[PDB]
Design a protein around this ligand. Structure first.
Ligand SMILES: *[C@@H]1O[C@H](CO)[C@@H](O[C@@H]2O[C@H](CO)[C@@H](O)[C@H](O)[C@H]2NC(C)=O)[C@H](O)[C@H]1NC(C)=O
Ligand SMILES: *[C@@H]1O[C@H](CO)[C@@H](O)[C@H](O)[C@H]1NC(C)=O
Ligand SMILES: *[C@@H]1O[C@H](CO)[C@@H](O)[C@H](O)[C@H]1NC(C)=O
Ligand SMILES: OC[C@H]1O[C@@H](O)[C@H](O)[C@@H](O)[C@H]1O
Ligand SMILES: OC[C@H]1O[C@H](O)[C@H](O)[C@@H](O)[C@H]1O
Ligand SMILES: [Ca+2]
Length: 427
């Protein structure tokens, strides 16, 4: 089973996974994924969900880890974001931290809850401002010293100043500032310790819109920290995502991000990629389809076959576009609204296959494209805004192919313009 960024992910019961703003905890060889339940299409608090898996693909929904409490700061009128859980060895206790806020983000607190088992349910113990100052986007990092010292990483002072501060021995309170990046406008933080060095991954502040996420490193959490560098090509806006959790994996890591859909928040998707450290620093591997070997601490990227859209057969009013951002320097434009392209001679062993559509969409809103395989009934594929007419991203579609040769037609029947199609990759 494969990790396929941007698809609609469902749990073992077949229900949409609702765990945005991910926090991960490993117990044994089980991964616990905590997140925000947005099934109600709202930024206000419904639950902190809890899912488990052995392989980072096949997730079983457990009891919710945190439920709202009326008349408190975790009421259903309030905001609970970006939950994180670490285990406290001294107390044999799981401690959850989260961003605790009002609906207009004017309160800027953390909240804390505890449990004796990983999915809890957890008992909320209150919300507070760390050292009396704002905390909005946050994460928690647990170091590998004998004391397992933990730290809050947080956007402070109306998001302008990024802070790292040490937690007490219970992981209940922030008690000393460790470093601050004044004017850094960083949010969505996480830290992975790799080769003895601390690596901070963070986004800048653009609300729900994605932006180029950055890495910084230091030999001490007190700094000095290096200046920001990109984890992905800047035009792609972190391949249309925002950092949520950075999970170590052998000699590398896994980038776990959210693709926020602010007009329909429960349909926000999950963008998980290998975070390769072979250059000495974290770089996203743009892997449409990949898997993890947990015991070996490795990842494997699926190989596919590319087909350029411009080499297909156009029908109707579609055109050939030229641009440096496209594979082959070309793409097919004016798709939909009477224009089609058919990609022929797609060889396959048949059955269900992931097919990545590489496209550009310069609008600020989603487009979509109809897809028919071998003349079968049409499906509709969402095409998010890509960041520019010359900026290509990819979305996955799990198509049923025939054993042998296949033809795939794009854009038939739809009155709206689809995105511009650069190529497809058949896995
Ligand atoms: C497929 O994409 C089209 C746009 O290419 C969507 O049509 C837009 O729908 C919104 C409503 O969310 C309207 O406000 C816009 O005026 C429409 N734009 C155009 C150009 O028609 C359509 O909703 C998408 N289909 C699905 C199922 O999401
Ligand atoms: C998915 O997880 C469930 C629960 O542990 C397990 O019973 C099932 O076999 C898993 N599916 C696959 C394909 O391994
Ligand atoms: C948390 O630590 C700060 C800094 O020492 C202190 O001012 C505050 O009173 C502490 N909070 C609690 C609940 O002990
Ligand atoms: O207005 C519709 C047009 O939008 C452009 O962004 C696109 O490059 C064209 O191929 C066509 O779809
Ligand atoms: O404010 C809306 C939204 O803004 C950013 O995307 C933050 O990283 C999210 O956690 C959320 O707070
Ligand atoms: Ca192309």
């Amino acid at each position: 089973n494969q990790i396929v960024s941007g698809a609609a992910w469902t749990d073992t019961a077949g229900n949409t996974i609702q765990a945005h703003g991910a926090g991960i905890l490993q117990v044994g060889s089980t991964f616990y994924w905590f997140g925000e339940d947005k099934s109600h299409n709202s930024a206000l608090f419904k639950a902190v969900s809890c899912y488990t898996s052995s392989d980072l693909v096949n997730w079983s929904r457990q009891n919710d880890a945190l439920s709202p409490i009326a008349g408190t700061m975790i009421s259903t009128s309030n905001v609970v974001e970006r939950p994180k859980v670490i285990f406290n060895q001294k107390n044999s206790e799981y401690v959850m931290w989260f961003h605790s806020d009002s609906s207009n983000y004017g309160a800027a607190m953390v909240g804390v809850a505890t449990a004796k088992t990983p999915c809890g349910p957890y008992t909320y113990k209150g919300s507070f401002k760390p050292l009396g100052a704002d905390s909005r986007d946050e994460s928690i990092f647990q170091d590998d010293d004998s004391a397992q010292t933990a730290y809050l990483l947080y956007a402070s002072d109306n998001n302008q100043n990024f802070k790292i501060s040490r937690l007490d021995a219970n992981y209940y309170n922030v008690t000393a500032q460790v470093s601050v990046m004044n004017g850094a406008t960083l949010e969505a933080p996480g830290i992975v310790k790799h080769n003895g060095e601390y690596f901070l991954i963070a986004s800048h502040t653009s609300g729900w819109a994605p932006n180029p996420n950055k890495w910084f490193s230091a030999s001490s959490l007190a700094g000095p920290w290096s200046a920001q560098q990109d984890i992905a090509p800047s035009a792609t806006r972190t391949w249309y995502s925002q950092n949520a959790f950075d999970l170590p994996l052998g000699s590398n890591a896994i980038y776990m991000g959210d693709r926020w859909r602010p007009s329909l928040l429960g349909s926000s998707r999950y963008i998980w990629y290998p975070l390769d450290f072979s250059s000495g620093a974290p770089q996203i591997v743009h892997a449409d389809v990949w898997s993890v070997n947990v015991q070996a601490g490795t990842y494997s990227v699926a190989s596919g076959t590319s087909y350029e859209a411009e080499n297909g057969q156009r029908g109707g009013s579609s055109t050939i576009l030229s641009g440096s951002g496209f594979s082959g320097g070309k793409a097919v434009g004016y798709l939909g609204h009477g224009g089609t392209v058919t990609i022929n001679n797609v060889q396959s062993n048949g059955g269900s296959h992931w097919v990545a559509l590489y496209f550009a969409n310069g609008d600020s809103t989603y487009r979509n494209v109809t897809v028919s395989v071998n003349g079968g009934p049409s499906v509709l594929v969402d095409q998010p805004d890509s960041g520019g007419g010359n900026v290509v991203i990819s979305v996955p579609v799990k198509l049923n192919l025939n054993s042998g040769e296949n033809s795939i037609t794009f854009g038939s029947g739809q009155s709206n313009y689809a995105a511009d199609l650069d190529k497809i990759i058949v896995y």
